[model samples]
Target: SMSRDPLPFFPPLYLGGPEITTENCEREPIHIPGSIQPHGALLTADGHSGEVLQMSLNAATFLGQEPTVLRGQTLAALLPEQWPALQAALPPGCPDALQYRATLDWPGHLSLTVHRVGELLILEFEPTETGPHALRNAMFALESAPNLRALAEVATQTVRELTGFDRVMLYKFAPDATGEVIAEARREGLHAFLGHRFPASDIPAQARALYTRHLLRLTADTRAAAVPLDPVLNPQTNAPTPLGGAVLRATSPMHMQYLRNMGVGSSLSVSVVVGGQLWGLIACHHQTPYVLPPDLRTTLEYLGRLLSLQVQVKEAADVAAFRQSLREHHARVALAAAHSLSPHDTLSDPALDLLGLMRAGGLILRFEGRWQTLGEVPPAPAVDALLAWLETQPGALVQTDALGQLWPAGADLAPSAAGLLAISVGWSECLVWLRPELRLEVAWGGATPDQAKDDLGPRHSFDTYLEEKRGYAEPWHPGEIEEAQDLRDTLTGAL
Candidate 1:
């Protein structure tokens, strides 16, 4: 990591300066089963015979007997007459449910969730609340949402009620893996986190991979004392059980600290997965200690999965419609050019223009001995300078949103020509598409450039921070670039 001058505030860890790396994260021991939050109890047992092997230190609080006495007992001892239900619930060869929810009334109607971790079966117990009917109702409610935005809006409200969290955010992921709070529901007077963007590094690669493998991650309280695993070693492996699949797996200290810094008392994150990849999360936060019943948490997890499918369908339809619009415009331009005898003039022809390429503010053609302009273009000198720079970068279809940064002369053209998508038609000629700068306000969740640094390393504020950004235009999409290349191929064929 190269040393840079200190900033006013600690930049996001994902910015990757000097302190954060895979090694730094591995040192934090998130996958090691050393401890768990005290709000619930974790019990591990043999997968085949259902024999209790290890359990959390706080198991006594819920199990009545000391954890040591509970060990070596058959899993059947706890459920007794319901042994067949426990066995059939997670049969080998079948895919595991999000989590197995059951009401254990023998001890008192306590709720339990069972999850599998390889050959070991992990069981978790918490308080009992609402029933199975709650989940079916949630699914039916989501079915009526008309669009993705509407689905997100309804999901936030539904989850806030079902889980009783102070704030619920439907975080959406961008193509870059960064996340944004697109929709949110909160209790009265709580700070709203709507529209805040989180850098990709905020959720590390390892954490994201785990979310893809396991759909739900929950921390009932940030400040609660963590209960350590009693045995500390898997009886079968004679080593630490890889807690990647364990529900009571200890959280990373840094992550816990980050949450505490934000003044968040508890949190639950349910993965929104699509096509076997993590798309985003339905993040729920509370201002004080909070724990949901086994069935309620499971219901929210199932709802996240359902919403992912809904998002997949709606986004796929939107993409198809946009592409169809682009294709029709291209077809019209292609037909008109086929009838023109002068090929070069046909490209620069006003009537034959394909304005959909960049949602263009202007179109410039610097063909060999033929110069043309349409709409709002840059000064002739600035355009000449840009074309000169493009020649040096051999064979690249040039694209940029901040032209003023690379070409100082482009500063004056920022309002009308901040972004460009250009393709070389032949050896000495090129076609350029331009778009004007669009000033936008981006809401940030944490510290700003103006915020001062403290012993906490950076700003601790989790309030909405608005950034008035300028000197940038909408970035070119991959489809837009492909369309520009398609036009060039058609023009080259006409020649």
Candidate 2:
């Protein structure tokens, strides 16, 4: 048994400074953090001359040269064999594009990635290792999936296999920006978060914005100290190099705290961008500090793109199937309406099954200032009040799952009409469809009281918090709304 009390709202602390609250979280300067993760090194050089402007303090650890020695040196001087090829491969004037250069066997076996911001060309170097041929197999599995759920399940499993992360989840975002772990693959003994919901506060707006720009992000170690850039700012612009496009960019302090709270040592997030919008994420978590080799990281990035395509394909198919069903329902209703003398007569016909046509529990028809009701309905007085309220509402169609919230007087109608889909056929005449309340018990992640620290940072626990939802009905789908509009058009034309 779980407590029915609502979970307390805890605003997340901003990443950079302490002055701002939840409203200012989006203003955090995450893209120009002036730092890189400890596992890799970064260098920024003049795009034209390849003269090194800034390098990470730990450049010696990977490049075999100190930042002081690298300053004013050209990339051509550093890697004589690969410099020309890397420069040739760079896309012209694309600041956001991260181009992958070849893996170098000289000096050290390092994987190199190149990108440009204005005249500044940035290069990242990370340790390289052999990766498997997982992309082709993952693509086959995804294409064979029958639906979105199956696709998500297969993707999580595939990514988990490729990355060897302890846990992998397919997290989908709602319209309100909250997230739900719809599919998961985890170690046998690990706690399952398959159906857990996360508040939008868990991922601030700034973080979400970055996800759309960068397809993949990795935090090799939650506890590792960030290596500050040598000059701290670009000598050309006097601003931090926009690490937004950098692979080795350090994670935000707030996000690092979030992972630490969940007991995740290393994590990876691959954005699933569909139709140019971020649809969801394939999030991976490991209990121990884990650095993904550059080759494996590239493979995961390709896998993300494949998953995005599959999602778009499956959703389009689903919408087409749903619209087809609506067309059938419309044909039946149109036939009945065409033969009937009035709106009331057409709605009252038992054979028409108006409720089933709209997938509603109740149906109400009003014409010539007269009301005719069928199936379950609110009281006559409540109905009259609702009709009066609808008269003042804007638009030809009005729909909602939580009718009570929109119209306080409709709260008493919760038993029969929590969800409403209404269409005005004429100035005074309308058709209304109602759905009964649908109760839901939602499990929220990191909802325990123990996680409620006074610091206002990320929650300190990942325990499940059960919440009972009421006064809501099964939501009207997009297809349903469009069907209602089509019916209104037909009715207006018939009259």
Candidate 3:
């Protein structure tokens, strides 16, 4: 399991060194390596131009490590599916966001990015950071377009021009937090990911948090250095140069292992922020280790901003519309039940509107009337028992297996709740409605318990794989339902 220790708050490395120059740039570079750039740092924020955000050494010291440690880590190994409470611990300038910081195949190294014209913080690690050249221009161009389809065409072109990654795509994250490529910018014969979608379990809330924390995060090699455990201000020769980047042993076993597993070594995630939230990620997957040049970094950063603004104008509204459309249908249903008019049938309006909204087929709702179906099949009392079993154990969202051991049979109840609701969000006014997906294989990748790491890939790959495997046909985990309830409580009275 990943450690929850606060001892190592590794910060992202300040790239390109200080913008200082002449007298200032000539000063010692922050933590200049005794062997590498043992030179002086140029300057401080000459004018507020582009100073990398300051972060703690916890990440580097804690995260940057030999590759061996990284490969074995799955986000679940360290934390729960959601850690909103941990997010509350962040101080000012860092808000609890949908993205997060977590180390995958690569050890110790973590990443985040500045996005939406710096309106939101996107997190993830690959090894390259992207920024916007001009938010206003990008916004205006999208505004000039006819519709999303047209906007995507322009956006794809912009993507190729912005980030040099072979496949530039605008990935659409589903309501369930799963995502797919809605559009793409590719080189003539490059493999296309335009129609691919992945499951939310692959990335999960914790993995996404990595992106929100580390914008423009990159992993030159997965086996990068973890922030050292020592509390030194800076490990590099010069103390102030911002030794924020995780330094992995160039030949770390974990990194090599990761490369072998994922079929890549270098990677980058430049967030495409839409509105004020992290809408999706711009993933750069490379087959070999890559060091982005300074100019390219600047360009990617610039384009990142451009994409953020562009994404909000084009992508954000559609996301809101899609959610609203679902809510619209649910709202009608809610109105129909406002007077407590119906039961097994009345409210039977399919609270699983959430299920269909997310394109899943299974749903479990427990009220005066109960309904549990595999695929429109009448749910047996056994399904209700599975749901009641789930209700017995409550958290924001608890995985059934975590609660399954207490079962009367002391065995797998998965066959019954093939895609079990597995959790309750609201205490009374409709707790939860899962698809009884006891099939861990669909929600996760394993056929049995304790198989999370067996077949699934890291945050991104596994996500891509899961969605493709499910094809939006099976019942999925309604984990985000907790957040939905929370959002409801935030807007209306708590349930």
The top-ranked prediction according to TM-score is 2
For residues 350-376, write the lDDT of model 2, one tens digit per residue: 887878867899888899869999989
Output the worst ten-in-a-row residue range by lDDT, candidate 2.
1-10
Candidate 2 regions with alpha-carbon error over 4 angstroms: 1-23, 130-133, 448-455
Off by over 4 Å in 1: 1-27, 48-51, 76-101, 129-141, 366-371, 379-381, 392-396, 404-416, 425-429, 448-459, 477-479, 492-494
C-alpha lDDT (0 to 100) for residue 135 of candidate 1: 67
Clashing pairs in 1: none
Residues 237-334, candidate 3, lDDT per residue (tens digit)? 23433222222212222223444465555666576665545677766656565666444654565666766666566555666656666666556544
RMSD of 3: 15.6
The C-alpha TM-scores of every prediction are 0.83, 0.93, 0.46
lDDT of 1 at 128: 71
**Rank ordering of all candidates by lDDT, starting from the highest:** 2, 1, 3
Determine the backbone clash count of candidate 2: 0
After TM-score superposition, the amount by which residue 265's alpha carbon in candidate 1 deviates from its true location, in angstroms, is 2.1
Q: Candidate 1, after superposition: displacement of residue 262 in Å?
A: 2.5
